[PDB]
Amino acid sequence: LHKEPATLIKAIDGDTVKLMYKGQPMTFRLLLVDTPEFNEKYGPEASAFEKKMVENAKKIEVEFDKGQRTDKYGRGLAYIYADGKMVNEALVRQGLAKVAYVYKGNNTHEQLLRKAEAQAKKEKLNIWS
Ligand SMILES: Cc1cn([C@H]2C[C@H](OP(=O)(O)O)[C@@H](COP(=O)(O)O)O2)c(=O)[nH]c1=O
Numbered sequence: 001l002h003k004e005p006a007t008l009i010k011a012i013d014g015d016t017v018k019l020m021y022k023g024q025p026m027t028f029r030l031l032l033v034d035t036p037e038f039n040e041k042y043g044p045e046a047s048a049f050e051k052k053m054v055e056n057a058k059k060i061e062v063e064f065d066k067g068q069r070t071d072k073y074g075r076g077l078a079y080i081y082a083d084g085k086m087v088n089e090a091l092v093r094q095g096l097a098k099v100a101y102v103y104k105g106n107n108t109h110e111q112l113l114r115k116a117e118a119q120a121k122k123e124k125l126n127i128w129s
């Protein structure tokens with residue numbers, strides 16, 4: 001897997017972000033996670049968390065997995081990094097996302113994220129409280 005440059009356009013909610021990638025605007029959906037919708041419990045906090053993470057970054061990077069790179073809605077499917085820290089992993093680690101939508105062939109970081117989820121749940125953080 002490879003990290004590729006991109007620049008923030010707009011944080012959208014806990015697990016979607018608009019980025020400029022290869023010079024084109026696109027909505028990215030974070031692989032292997034599910035945050036609550038903004039209307040649900042911890043939704044605003046997931047949104048706020050993702051936003052701060054990408055807005056504070058000097059460097060945003062996109063990492064595609066080995067399988068499909070866009071979903072059925074045209075959203076990019078990637079791991080997103082903020083100054084080298086994976087946003088997908090961080091959300092799970094804080095108990096602001098569940099590991100979710102694990103499809104064969106786009107699951108390189110599954111076991112890393114499940115480990116973070118186990119730590120969040122142990123700590124009774126946020127959605128696990
Ligand atoms: C994360 C991810 C979501 N999706 C699709 C599955 C779901 O279809 P449905 O919309 O039919 O439920 C939807 C979940 O996205 P959201 O959690 O953003 O709503 O996005 C993929 O197809 N591949 C993926 O890797």
Ligand SMILES: [Ca+2]
Nearest residue numbers: 015034035036
């Ligand atoms: Ca969601």
